[PDB]
């Protein structure tokens, strides 16, 4: 089997920038060569064929080079959609195998977060747990602490948080942190306070709401 | 327009097998070869196989001999692939893709089937809302407690788009998932419209509209 290697994963790059994403071959393709592009929904587009051809309706700030082992898609100015995986695929023998793709991190200009808290319903509570939501918007860069504050007692070991994938417009990150306690350790406390740091904040900025 | 329409979701149990179905349109489905591709989650592609429609002729990966079989149905237009014998390394997302003749390349792609391999029970998600207890106003749905992925969540049947984020599941150590679904509104055009979540949980047939109010 020809191994198709894309020895760089994860790529950073400006808004504007030329960007080259390549791949290796074990043994020579004859220039039978495809990139693919993948959004972070999972879809997948056709890019380029054959080392170098646009597929019909794919913007010409794509092209394709090489030939023999090595291949390279070249960007020729970033855009904000330009963010996703690309894969390199050779079908030059049986099994057709594909490069281990290279992920792209938009670089943009710092927007801190704006900052939301949403306490748990009751609909949640009469079932024994308490969900405590806080939710981060449309900032860049992905660095962000966010740390639960229970009475002005830091919380440790009691949240879990998720992050969305780079936005195609306007290239942010959004995260939530959900804070879970049993309805009874809920119900012992008065204020919920979560508190976030980022580089577009010249302080912290800390959202809260009391129970009761 | 060409489209490559994939099945549901499906969860099923470690030695069962599993098929899926890759419905085509926009082109007669007979001209052209269809491949599989696999996608292990974090991972690459891999090509499982190809069958030429036309006369049912097969190619597979040497590595899927054992586990794959591609079949069509000239009449629906839509081609099948069987995996058998499934253990967790068969949890993935399945594409179908169209073969073209320029100098070949995948280029049409299913939006791919999602297979989770378990001993678990399916289980639907609860939905609660999130409301606050400014420029812009914040709300949600928390999706609490489902198995398998994936739910999809919508708002106010598809007509709300922007400001909405739907973050990715996160496994909690119940071995269950939860996610939160949240949009925010300039305050201005918060009370203009009502706020409903739709979550839609496939493999345990749930379907919930919740709906957030908005505080008086």
């Known amino acids: 089997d020809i191994q198709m290697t894309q020895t760089t994963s994860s790529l950073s790059a400006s808004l504007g920038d030329r960007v080259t994403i390549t791949c290796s071959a074990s043994?020579?393709?004859?220039?039978?060569l495809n990139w693919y592009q993948q959004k972070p929904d999972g879809t997948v587009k056709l890019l380029i064929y054959?080392?170098?051809s646009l597929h019909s309706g794919v913007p010409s700030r794509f092209s394709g080079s090489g030939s023999g082992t090595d291949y390279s898609l070249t960007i020729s100015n970033l855009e904000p959609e330009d963010i996703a995986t690309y894969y390199c695929?050779?079908?030059?023998?049986?099994?057709?195998?594909f490069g281990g793709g290279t992920k792209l991190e938009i670089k943009r200009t710092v927007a801190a977060p704006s900052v939301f808290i949403f306490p748990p319903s009751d609909e949640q509570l009469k079932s024994g747990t308490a969900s405590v939501v806080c939710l981060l918007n449309n900032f860049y860069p992905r660095e962000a602490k966010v740390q639960w504050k229970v009475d002005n007692a830091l919380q440790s070991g009691n949240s879990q948080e998720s992050v969305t994938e780079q936005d195609s417009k306007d290239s942010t990150y959004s995260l939530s942190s959900t804070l879970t306690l049993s309805k009874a350790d809920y119900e012992k406390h008065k204020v919920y306070a979560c508190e976030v740091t980022h580089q577009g904040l010249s302080s912290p900025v800390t959202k809260s709401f009391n129970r009761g | 327009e060409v489209q490559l329409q994939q099945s549901g979701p499906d969860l099923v149990k470690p030695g069962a097998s599993v098929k899926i179905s890759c419905k085509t349109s926009?082109?007669?489905?007979?001209?052209?070869?269809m491949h599989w591709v696999k996608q292990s989650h974090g991972k690459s592609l891999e090509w499982i196989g190809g069958?030429?429609?036309?006369?049912?002729?097969?190619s597979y990966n040497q590595k899927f001999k054992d586990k794959a079989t591609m079949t069509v149905d000239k009449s629906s237009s839509t081609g099948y692939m069987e995996l058998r014998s499934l253990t967790s390394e068969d949890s993935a997302v399945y594409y179908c893709?169209?073969?073209?003749?320029?100098?070949?390349?995948?280029?049409?792609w299913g939006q791919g089937t999602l297979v989770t391999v378990s001993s678990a029970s399916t289980k639907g998600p609860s939905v609660f809302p999130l409301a606050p207890c400014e420029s812009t106003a914040a709300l949600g749905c928390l999706v609490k407690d489902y198995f398998p992925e994936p739910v999809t969540v919508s708002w106010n049947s598809g007509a709300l788009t922007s400001g909405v984020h739907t973050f990715p599941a996160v496994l909690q150590s119940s071995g269950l998932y939860s996610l939160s679904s949240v949009v925010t509104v300039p305050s201005s055009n918060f009370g203009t419209q009502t706020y409903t979540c739709n979550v839609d949980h496939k493999p345990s047939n749930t379907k919930v509209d919740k709906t957030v109010e908005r505080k008086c």
């Open positions: 893709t169209r073969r073209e003749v320029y100098y070949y390349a995948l280029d049409y």
């Open positions: 926009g082109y007669t489905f007979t001209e052209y070869i």
């Open positions: 069958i030429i429609p036309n006369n049912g002729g097969t």
């Open positions: 043994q020579g393709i004859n220039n039978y």
């Open positions: 054959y080392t170098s």
């Open positions: 695929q050779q079908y030059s023998n049986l099994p057709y195998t």
